[PDB]
């Protein structure tokens, strides 16, 4: 039942991954250095694996169209997430509402 936005988050929070995916250090951006290897241990995490970036990335666009996250702008790989009350709510139940 892991969602996408729990996996990037357990990949950030591991400094050892900035190779490919990493907090920016600006509030809660985080860019993704390396748009193919993110998808191909996503598509190993859920034993997908076709999968590949184009597919993650609806999955980011569907998260930034619900504004619990925000693409950055002038950037192809940069998102934030957001820190708001209601977005908070959706971080907290993923699974039940």
Request: aromatic content about 16%.
């Amino acid at each position: 039942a892991l969602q996408l936005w729990q996996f990037l988050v357990a990949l950030l929070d591991d400094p050892t991954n900035a190779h490919f995916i990493a907090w920016t250090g600006r509030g809660m951006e985080f860019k993704l250095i390396e748009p193919e290897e993110v998808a191909r241990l996503w598509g190993i995490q859920k034993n997908r694996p076709a999968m590949n970036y184009d597919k993650l990335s609806r999955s980011l666009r569907y998260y930034y169209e619900k504004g619990i996250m925000q693409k950055v702008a002038g950037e192809r790989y940069v998102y934030k997430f957001v820190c708001e009350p209601e977005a908070l709510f959706s971080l907290a139940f993923p699974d039940n509402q």
